[PDB]
Structure 1
Amino acid sequence: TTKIEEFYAQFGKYILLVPGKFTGTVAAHDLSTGRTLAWLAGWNYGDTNPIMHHMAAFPSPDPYKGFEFIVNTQGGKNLFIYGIPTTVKEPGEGFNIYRVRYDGTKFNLVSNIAEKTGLGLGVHVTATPDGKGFAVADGQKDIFAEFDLATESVRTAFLVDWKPNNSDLKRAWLEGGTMTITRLKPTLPGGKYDYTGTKGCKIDWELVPGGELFLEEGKVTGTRQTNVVALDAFVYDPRGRWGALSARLPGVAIIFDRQDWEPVVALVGAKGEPSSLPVKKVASDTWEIKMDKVVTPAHQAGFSPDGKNFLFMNGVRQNNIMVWDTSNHADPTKWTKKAVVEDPGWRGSYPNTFHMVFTPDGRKVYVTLWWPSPTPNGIAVVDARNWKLLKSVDIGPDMHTLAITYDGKYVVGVFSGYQKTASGIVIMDTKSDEVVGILPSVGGHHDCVIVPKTVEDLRCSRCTTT
């Protein structure tokens, strides 16, 4: 009685790429036809714990003829935090970083960059603004690195450590501390690092949403629980030069100079706290940030497409979107808080505002509203000129990432069932801010991307935000 063609025809020619989390897959879907173009199952290749996690795709002149992406995995006890009644005793170690190419017919597993480099990193993956490199961060090890794609080599790698003022676990962040940033050097032959698999972990799983409190309360296992900062992402200024490394537990975004590979300033999320704190060089490869207190954790971080705003979402002890004026491209020490988005319905840990995407023209930003079961999860629409919440829309359980078609017309998001219940791909019209439909999805996806054609597209992809 009704055909789907008009539904798909409205989108134009865009490919959605998704990781599957506990499914172990990655897949590309053609939004113009409904077909899944290709998929890959990590366990087929001998990855015995393929928790396919985060990803970024590089610009392709014609995605339908080919494209490339990076996808990483988690492992270890990350298998055990979603309530699945598995009897597995010894999970695979994970922390793989895979380069995958679509060739117009199928996916090709090109390389395991974690094995090649020795850096096993399991949290966000971001493409550089020129599309020629990528970063990966890890919040169990508190390491991040930027990689060159062509040579599959490490450009830089850093370790971040917390030395708490108060050694009591419940007070280890509230009462402040010193954050130390160390540029790593490889320790193994052939310029390799020694961080494969679970090696380097301070805690046994990535902190969950609101999970700072669970860490404080003694509910997260690991060997260095009071030294974690929970690095999350290295997001890029679309204008070049700078990246921002988010550290969830201290609620700080450390700005790095990608030319000199040095941290230059530390933005402090919390409302009522300074815009930033200085970074002091204490040795050739070591810098420190000193905090008298940590008012609140923070998570989502990123830049508007023009690079003139930077956002950091406070959570847990405050629940707001902090905005800095980053218009001065020359000097990040001058970046200053300019606005804060609040709502009477945003308090505490939930909603956890842990993904976003801007419209290409910068006028709006869409923000995930995540909650534990059974509260409906959804999407907030924020006015990114006046910095005010416009609307919230309920979607389903366990809402994750938001991408946008590069013409700015449709937001495409994923929800993931807490790895056990309802999941899907949701599409929202950006003019009406209404959901136009849900498509089925066998996936627990905590990421999604639309394959870009240009470097300009990356300004609204997995580059500037997560």
Structure 2
Amino acid sequence: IEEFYAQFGKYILLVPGKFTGTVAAHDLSTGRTLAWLAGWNYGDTNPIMHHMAAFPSPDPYKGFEFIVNTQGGKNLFIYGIPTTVKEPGEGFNIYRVRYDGTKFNLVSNIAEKTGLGLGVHVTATPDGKGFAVADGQKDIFAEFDLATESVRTAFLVDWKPNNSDLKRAWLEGGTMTITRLKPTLPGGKYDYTGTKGCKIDWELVPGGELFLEEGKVTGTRQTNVVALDAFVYDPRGRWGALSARLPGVAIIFDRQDWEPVVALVGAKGEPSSLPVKKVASDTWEIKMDKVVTPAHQAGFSPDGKNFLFMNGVRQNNIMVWDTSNHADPTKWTKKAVVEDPGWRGSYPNTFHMVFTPDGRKVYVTLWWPSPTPNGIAVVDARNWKLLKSVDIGPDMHTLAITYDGKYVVGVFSGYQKTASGIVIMDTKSDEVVGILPSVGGHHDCVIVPKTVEDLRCSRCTTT
């Protein structure tokens, strides 16, 4: 067994636990868990540990830092756990955690310091000195400076539907408005702690994008939701892509002047992009005459020359843009679309991804609801053809890769109530080399990076 682990190399796997309330680092070279922390011990009464990213450390085994965030409110009530809790904790914390070579230290709550409570993807910036967080119930994203724990920028995104009827509010198109946000409380604090700011009272769960149009999700501004998901970074610098699941759009922002420059449109058969028009000193718009399908997971390739966005449910595919023109995102155009006849139903959804460091392949999860086994698609990232699908387990989420390129490491999470695990796949044979047990509902995972170059294949360039 130690022979088993000695193949993997000295890589540390970090995972949040979703409804377990924990975060944990595992030493893939020995099978030992190095450290873990349980949010509830600190008085977080609803620690839905959601997403995270880790910063470059010259020796992760001596120390490393990471951000992990949580959801809260009625997000406790949507995974089927028959809890009698009446008033769930507000959550939406953004925790800075440092491993000191023995234990995790809860260093700070960045959500409490800044007033932005945001509970979906966390991504590191490519120089490892800042991070972004987005939220799909509030439709806000921000980028943060790690050293000062302060907001660099924050934006609200809003939908104005053509047809105010809920079932048609996205299908018949609408106007997306992007507004740069400014702090409203004393001290330069934002007023978005806890559940404050929500358009809907819980998130749109994996594979659940259409649940809002279907009348399944309560809240006060249902038809104004776009479900922001993530801000992923071009590894070349300068640009980030903000995914918005309901319009199926990735808005490219220029991080130099903090403006949106163009809007990629996910659906197959739809234009490569739509323009972003500025309408006010801090406000921009995108007009869409229709929305063919929602989309979710998004990512750049290691060299930044491709960007992927996974259309889901109304279409299940991998949409690929040629992003090789780093100077001009209005040049980025659809170059390929990975499809398969077996993805013609509502599920599976093409899901989380990770590229090999050499950019030659991308691994993409295939998610279904219970009880179909969920899996990993292996895709040739030179000719954009599906090579292989491999079944893994129920409710498969994210993939990380060891930074030598030799093993993909993924998690599945049992819909928070059935089987869960860590899977390791050998990238030479594309076969599963083992399952390790995992007490986790993880929707995320990362391998602690040593360099900035490692972030190109980490929770920086992709979800």
CA distance in 2, matches of 1:234, 1:410: 26
Report the CA distance between 1:149 and its aligned residue. 0.2
Q: Is the 8 A contact 2:51 2:443 kept in 1?
A: yes
Of residues 35, 38, 41 in structure 2, which corresponds to 1:41? 38
Q: Deviations over 1:42-74 (max 9, x none)?
A: 000000000000000000000000000000000
Q: Is the 8 A contact 2:178 2:285 kept in 1?
A: yes
Query: Could you list the runs of 4 or more consecutive aligned residues of structure 1 that deviate by over 6 angstroms after TM superposition?
Result: none
Report the CA distance between 1:5 and its aligned residue. 1.1
Q: Is the 8 A contact 2:207 2:367 kept in 1?
A: no
Aligned to 1:387: 384
Q: Is the 8 A contact 2:207 2:368 kept in 1?
A: no
CA distance in 2, matches of 1:348, 1:116: 45
1:207 aligns with 2:227: no
Q: Deviations over 1:281-308 (max 9, x none)?
A: 0000000000000011111111000000
Report the CA distance between 1:216 and its aligned residue. 1.1
Aligned to 1:73: 70
Q: Is the 8 A contact 1:202 1:223 kept in 2?
A: yes
1:424 aligns with 2:414: no
CA distance in 2, matches of 1:412, 1:41: 23
CA distance in 1, matches of 2:179, 2:225: 14
CA distance in 1, matches of 2:436, 2:62: 24
Report the CA distance between 1:203 and its aligned residue. 0.6
Determine helix, strand or coil for the equivalent of 1:435.
Answer: strand
Report the CA distance between 1:348 and its aligned residue. 4.0
Aligned to 2:248: 251
Aligned to 1:159: 156
Report the CA distance between 1:316 and its aligned residue. 1.4
Q: Is the 8 A contact 1:25 1:52 kept in 2?
A: yes
Report the CA distance between 1:166 and its aligned residue. 0.1
Q: Deviations over 1:129-188 (max 9, x none)?
A: 000000000000000000000000000000000000000000000000000000000011
Runs of 5+ unmatched residues, structure 2 = none
Q: Deviations over 1:385-417 (max 9, x none)?
A: 000000000001111110000000000000111
Q: Deviations over 1:347-382 (max 9, x none)?
A: 243112220000000000000111100000110000
Give the length in aligned residue pairs: 463
Report the CA distance between 1:210 and its aligned residue. 3.2
Question: 419-428 vs 211-220, which deviates more?
Answer: 211-220
Of residues 13, 33, 37 in structure 2, which corresponds to 1:16? 13
Q: Normalization by structure 2: what TM-score?
A: 0.99
CA distance in 1, matches of 2:252, 2:221: 25
Report the CA distance between 1:9 and its aligned residue. 0.4
Q: Deviations over 1:298-323 (max 9, x none)?
A: 11111000000000111111111110
Q: Is the 8 A contact 1:237 1:464 kept in 2?
A: yes
CA distance in 2, matches of 1:213, 1:308: 31
1:210 and 1:12, CA in 2 relative to 1: closer, same or farther beyond 3 A?
closer
Question: 236-245 vs 77-86, which deviates more?
Answer: 77-86
CA distance in 2, matches of 1:114, 1:209: 24
Q: Deviations over 1:230-283 (max 9, x none)?
A: 000000000000000000000000000000000000000011111000000000
Question: 362-371 vs 206-215, which deviates more?
Answer: 206-215
Report the CA distance between 1:209 and its aligned residue. 2.8
CA distance in 1, matches of 2:2, 2:226: 48
Q: Is the 8 A contact 1:209 1:352 kept in 2?
A: no
CA distance in 1, matches of 2:90, 2:275: 37
Determine helix, strand or coil for the equivalent of 2:342.
Answer: coil
Aligned to 2:22: 25
Aligned to 1:114: 111
Aligned to 1:83: 80
Question: 191-200 vs 345-354, which deviates more?
Answer: 345-354
CA distance in 2, matches of 1:392, 1:39: 33
Runs of 5+ unmatched residues, structure 1 = none
Determine helix, strand or coil for the equivalent of 1:354.
Answer: strand
Report the CA distance between 1:213 and its aligned residue. 2.1
Question: 153-162 vs 314-323, which deviates more?
Answer: 314-323
Determine helix, strand or coil for the equivalent of 1:226.
Answer: helix
Q: Is the 8 A contact 1:281 1:287 kept in 2?
A: yes
Report the CA distance between 1:205 and its aligned residue. 1.2
CA distance in 2, matches of 1:230, 1:360: 30
Map 1:256-295 onto structure 2 (within 5 A). 256-295=253-292
Q: Is the 8 A contact 1:209 1:349 kept in 2?
A: no
CA distance in 2, matches of 1:282, 1:118: 27
Q: Deviations over 1:95-132 (max 9, x none)?
A: 00000000000000000000000000000000000000
Q: Normalization by structure 1: what TM-score?
A: 0.99
Q: Is the 8 A contact 1:70 1:100 kept in 2?
A: yes
CA distance in 2, matches of 1:137, 1:52: 15
Q: Is the 8 A contact 1:323 1:339 kept in 2?
A: yes
Q: Is the 8 A contact 1:315 1:348 kept in 2?
A: no
Q: Deviations over 1:11-34 (max 9, x none)?
A: 110000000000000000001111
Determine helix, strand or coil for the equivalent of 2:341.
Answer: coil
Q: Deviations over 1:422-443 (max 9, x none)?
A: 1111000000000001111111
Q: Is the 8 A contact 1:426 1:439 kept in 2?
A: yes
Determine helix, strand or coil for the equivalent of 2:415.
Answer: helix
Determine helix, strand or coil for the equivalent of 1:246.
Answer: strand
Report the CA distance between 1:212 and its aligned residue. 2.7
Q: Is the 8 A contact 1:9 1:32 kept in 2?
A: yes
Q: Is the 8 A contact 1:122 1:136 kept in 2?
A: yes
